Amino acid sequence: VGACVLCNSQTSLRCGACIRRPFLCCKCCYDHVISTSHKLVLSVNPYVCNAPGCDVTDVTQLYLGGMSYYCKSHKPPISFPLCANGQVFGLYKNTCVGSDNVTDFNAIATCDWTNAGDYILANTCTERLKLFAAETLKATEETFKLSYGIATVREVLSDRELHLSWEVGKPRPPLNRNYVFTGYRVTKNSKVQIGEYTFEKGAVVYRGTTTYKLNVGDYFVLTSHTVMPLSAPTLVPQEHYVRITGLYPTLNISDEFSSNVANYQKVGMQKYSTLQGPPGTGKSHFAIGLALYYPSARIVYTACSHAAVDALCEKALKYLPIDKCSRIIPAVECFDKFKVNSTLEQYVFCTVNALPETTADIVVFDEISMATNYDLSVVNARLRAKHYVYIGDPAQLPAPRTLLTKGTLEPEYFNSVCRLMKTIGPDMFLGTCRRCPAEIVDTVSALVYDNKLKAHKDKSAQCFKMFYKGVITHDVSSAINRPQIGVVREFLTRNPAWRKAVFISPYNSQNAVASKILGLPTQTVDSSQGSEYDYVIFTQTTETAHSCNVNRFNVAITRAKVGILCIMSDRDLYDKLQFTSLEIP
Ligand SMILES: CC(=O)N1CCC[C@](O)(C(=O)O)C1
Ligand SMILES: [Zn+2]
Ligand SMILES: [Zn+2]
Ligand SMILES: [Zn+2]
């Protein structure tokens, strides 16, 4: 028994073809089964024919005869059909309201999540369907990981290098950081974990969580977890107040945080607030400063990634009493300078998926572009707070969508929070970039921030752009542009100071080739998000939707503190770069 995800109507029916098995009311369960291929219906029991060796599960072909269920062929003389009168049969038959359209729930229940349209709907549908879609997608995501073949260590060529043998008649996952494996040792009568791992083409390179002397017969699977059901909404109901509520501002504040005093008062004057923090505008400075402005306030700092939480811990270590901070870790190497797993500490730093059930004066949820509606609901379900602050930049990168192939996902569709920030705008905006030379601020201000991002620094005069298509080669799941690496190699012979540069590209294989030929440290745009370097060399590599995604480009070129060389493929973004042009040698 439970609640009808379309009506709320109390019901004893869940669709058994739906991977989540959502409770549906007589009217909603019926309208669902007759308009789609879903025909298995679950109650206190499953509406299946209880006859001996009969394979009827379709609820439109089944009858209640006695207190058992039968098809047409096996039914007793006295029966009624399970599924007639525009309704399906269970408990609470007389309480049931229905819907004028069931169209959105059917599409959510039946899509394979390969089309952008599927994510657009999951983000514009009613709130209760946002949860259903968030669960349904995540389960589809964790199941798709099972479809991948096991990889087995056939030979240990060296340290940090292997020869893999792959399961037959199953696809092989891409070998990039977005696919984290889990090793396993071959025991008497089972298997035991041996750290998480990643792989990249050579034989294969492997960068594992822990070090070992792993040997033949050891194997690797992408560990998938149980997806729990969602109760709480993605955003609580908004409330605007006329005074600061439940929070007592400080009388003395330092000139370090004085620029955020207006913004921190806004935080106290509404239930939830969005802060768009572009690159190097001071998001974590803002987050920690909130603690100093409201000194007695209990604050849970949360983000999706360990990295994101740890960076909040680093900043907190510089400004807040260590004895008042705690890092929550579930029983990967993260921050270890606070007492571990102390829920009742004033300042609690913890990933979304590890949150305890607790209350707080303020909740800060950082790197919000990376959040899914699933994460949004979980936080609302674990944390009951006087105030909620969402910090991020919908102009930066989202959580990768492993199933998406048709269409681009626009930032207004990354999650409920990014949708608000792109439709009504963000409550607060950090308008001054401290990190990047002016040529780079001017470029991304126009490109994705509506000319509202201002440069601290001056022109560096060390921002260059070269238009060079070169030659694109493809391997199993990535792109390589060797002539673009060549152009960079020639550039470093004539400009050897740039040998301190980080190499960035949109492709892990480009990076692996660039690492051999150049010896620069390498990052995917996607791994570079939240890091800064004095000097950045960027090869676009292709003109795909992937290498031209304006959020990706935004992150690529805002990594640079001093200078950047951009070797471009796309005539569009090249022409948008407010950088010095260089001829091809
Ligand atoms: C769609 C696409 O081409 N991608 C996103 C996933 C990683 C990637 O395959 C790579 O790093 O090679 C690039
Ligand atoms: Zn269904
Ligand atoms: Zn219903
Ligand atoms: Zn039967």
Swiss-Prot record:
Chain positions recorded as Zn(2+) 11 binding sites: C4, C7, C25, C28
Effect of substituting A360V: In strain: Theta/P.3
Binding positions (Zn(2+) 12): C15, C18, H32, H38
Ranges for the LRR repeats: 223-243
Superkingdom per UniProt: Viruses
Annotated effect of mutating Q87H: In strain: Iota/B.1.526
Outcome of mutating E333D: In strain: Gamma/P.1
Subcellular location: Host endoplasmic reticulum-Golgi intermediate compartment
Known partners and oligomeric status: Interacts with nsp8 to form the replication-transcription complex (RTC): nsp12, nsp7, two subunits of nsp8, and up to two subunits of nsp13. Interacts with host TBK1; this interaction inhibits TBK1 phosphorylation and decreases by 75% IRF3 phosphorylation, which leads to reduced IFN-beta production.
Biological role: Plays a role in viral RNA synthesis. Multi-functional protein with a zinc-binding domain in N-terminus displaying RNA and DNA duplex-unwinding activities with 5' to 3' polarity. Activity of helicase is dependent on magnesium. Binds to host TBK1 and inhibits TBK1 phosphorylation; the interaction with TBK1 decreases IRF3 phosphorylation, which leads to reduced IFN-beta production.
Name of this protein: Helicase nsp13
Organism: Severe acute respiratory syndrome coronavirus 2
Gene behind the chain: rep
Full-protein residues shown: 5326 to 5917 of 7096
